[PDB]
Write a protein of this length. Structure first.
Length: 119
């Protein structure tokens, strides 16, 4: 038939579009943040493409959720850096976005388990 078989296994939750509605009202202030994966990293490519980040989001908050996003174990950890830059946790995304604001308005961030830097 044309219809579809509803099942919990498939978990159409995310497949639903109504979600965007509630999120559109619950989260008014948001910025287009796109996390990319480096080529010289052993970190797996995250499934979630777009990341609805609020204008009041902080680096620390993003890093905390990140671990839960990739279901990464405690044995290891990862961090997000923009243009080879790793700002503090207090650093507000809304502030870092205006600085690294793409030529056509767009936040660019990279996630990995390394910084390739030293002390």
């Amino acid at each position: 038939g044309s219809m579809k078989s509803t099942f919990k296994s498939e978990y159409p939750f995310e497949k639903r579009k109504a979600e965007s509605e509630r999120i559109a009202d619950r989260f008014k202030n948001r910025i287009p943040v796109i996390c990319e994966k480096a080529e010289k990293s052993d970190i797996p490519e995250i499934d979630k493409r777009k990341y609805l980040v609020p204008a009041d989001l902080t680096v620390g908050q993003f890093v905390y959720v990140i671990r839960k996003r990739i279901m990464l174990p405690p044995e290891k950890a990862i961090f997000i850096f923009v243009n080879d830059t790793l700002p503090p946790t207090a650093a507000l995304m809304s502030a870092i976005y205006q600085e690294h604001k793409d030529k056509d308005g767009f936040l660019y961030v990279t996630y990995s388990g390394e910084n390739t830097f030293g002390r």
